[PDB]
């Protein structure tokens, strides 16, 4: 039996854990919480942690743990299974990307059409969108968006964007809350990840949603796709089963289990999401290097400088 610290959405972890149990008869116990609270906890517990695996929304979250030598190496063969365009690889082979989540602009299509959308994510952080664009400054992918802007456009551009959001944007606590604000008609548009929308559309039926997705494309920083992944803890006693689980998550069956439950992009070439996602290739996502521990701190610094 294994214990998985879970910084992913509960629906995601439950789905993959259930599938793994059916497949192997190995029981999975989830410890769910905020990604950075769990990351902090794993560092504190160190070699005494009861965690066998850490599953989370953003591979960026693994950076500190890897530097602290807390993660166990994964088979290179497993890593190669999910290595697609734009996917980051762990330099120490001690974590693995598993699913893609695209940055998107969700908008109220009863109020706006694609003709009203911006060609660049930079264009939303302006007086034109004063009180009309939702953003989530505490979101993991939001932080990744900031890193990508810094890397792609430089710090001045990234800083002015953030200042533009502080002045013109409507702050929401979570992506889920932002999406609902658009559906409820409290804001015409918001910057979130793609899966929230497809999952809502499955529940309620697209015809009953006001919101639709806009993809900026053309390798714009707002076309960023970031990745969720998993790592095995070096401290794990259950190494056999922990590695088996992470392996499983990269397998055709483990990937199929995730995409059935959650509208994230599979990273295996032989798996098709039942959600009818905008084809990865049509996204025209830019490629960005992996977020280092230092990249992370730097982006947090810009957020603070901007007054967020
Ligand atoms: Fe999320």
């Amino acid at each position: 039996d294994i214990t998985v610290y879970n910084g992913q959405h509960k629906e995601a972890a439950t789905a993959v854990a259930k599938a793994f149990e059916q497949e192997t008869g190995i029981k999975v116990t989830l410890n769910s919480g905020k990604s950075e609270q769990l990351a902090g906890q794993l560092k504190e517990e160190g070699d005494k942690t009861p965690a066998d695996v850490f599953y989370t929304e953003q591979t960026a979250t693994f950076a500190d743990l890897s530097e602290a030598g807390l993660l166990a190496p994964i088979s290179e063969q497993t890593i190669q299974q999910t290595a697609q365009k734009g996917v980051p690889l762990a330099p120490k082979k001690d974590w693995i990307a598993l699913s893609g989540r695209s940055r998107v602009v969700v908008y109220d299509h009863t109020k706006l059409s694609e003709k009203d959308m911006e060609k660049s994510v930079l264009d939303y952080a302006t007086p034109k969108w004063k009180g009309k664009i939702g953003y989530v400054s505490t979101s993991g992918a939001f932080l990744e968006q900031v890193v990508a802007l810094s890397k792609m456009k430089g710090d001045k551009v990234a800083l002015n964007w953030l200042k533009g959001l502080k002045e013109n944007g409507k702050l929401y606590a979570k992506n889920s809350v932002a999406l609902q604000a658009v559906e409820n008609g409290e804001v015409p548009a918001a910057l979130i990840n793609n899966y929230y929308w497809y999952n809502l559309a499955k529940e309620k039926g697209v015809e009953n949603l006001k919101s639709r997705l806009y993809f900026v494309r053309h390798q714009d920083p707002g076309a960023l796709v970031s990745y969720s992944g998993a790592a095995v803890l070096k401290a794990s006693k259950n190494q056999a089963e922990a590695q088996k689980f992470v392996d499983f998550l990269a397998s055709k069956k483990g990937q199929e289990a995730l995409v059935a439950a959650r509208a994230e992009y599979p990273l295996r070439a032989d798996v098709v999401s039942p959600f009818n996602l905008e084809p990865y290739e049509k996204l025209e996502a830019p490629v960005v290097s992996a977020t280092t521990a230092q990249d992370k701190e730097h982006a947090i610094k810009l957020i603070e400088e901007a007054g967020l």
Side-chain angles (χ1 to χ4, degrees), residues 9 82 121 138 203 208-210 219 221 241 262 271 274 284-285:
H9 293 278
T82 59
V121 75
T138 59
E203 294 186 4
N208 299 305
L209 293 191
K210 288 188 190 165
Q219 293 91 209
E241 296 173 358
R262 309 290 295 170
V271 171
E284 293 172 353

Side-chain angles (χ1 to χ4, degrees), residues 16-26 28 241 244-245 248:
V16 304
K18 180 66 184 182
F20 178 72
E21 291 185 344
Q22 300 186 194
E23 180 58 45
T24 68
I26 301 162
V28 176
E241 296 173 358
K244 192 177 186 178
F245 179 70
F248 175 76

Side-chain angles (χ1 to χ4, degrees), residues 247-260:
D247 197 275
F248 175 76
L249 299 179
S251 76
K252 180 175 167 55
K253 279 188 180 176
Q255 291 269 305
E256 278 172 342
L258 176 72
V259 301

Side-chain angles (χ1 to χ4, degrees), residues 9 57 101 175 193 195-196:
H9 293 278
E57 294 196 70
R101 57 258 305 286
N175 289 319
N193 299 326
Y195 52 89
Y196 297 92

Side-chain angles (χ1 to χ4, degrees), residues 9 30 39 85 108 141 148 162 172 199 212-213 251 285 292 302 306:
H9 293 278
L30 297 176
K85 178 173 166 169
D108 179 351
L162 292 161
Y172 295 101
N199 273 85
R212 294 294 186 274
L213 291 187
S251 76
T292 61
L302 297 175

Side-chain angles (χ1 to χ4, degrees), residues 69 83 146 247 292 300 303:
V146 177
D247 197 275
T292 61
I300 292 175
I303 290 167

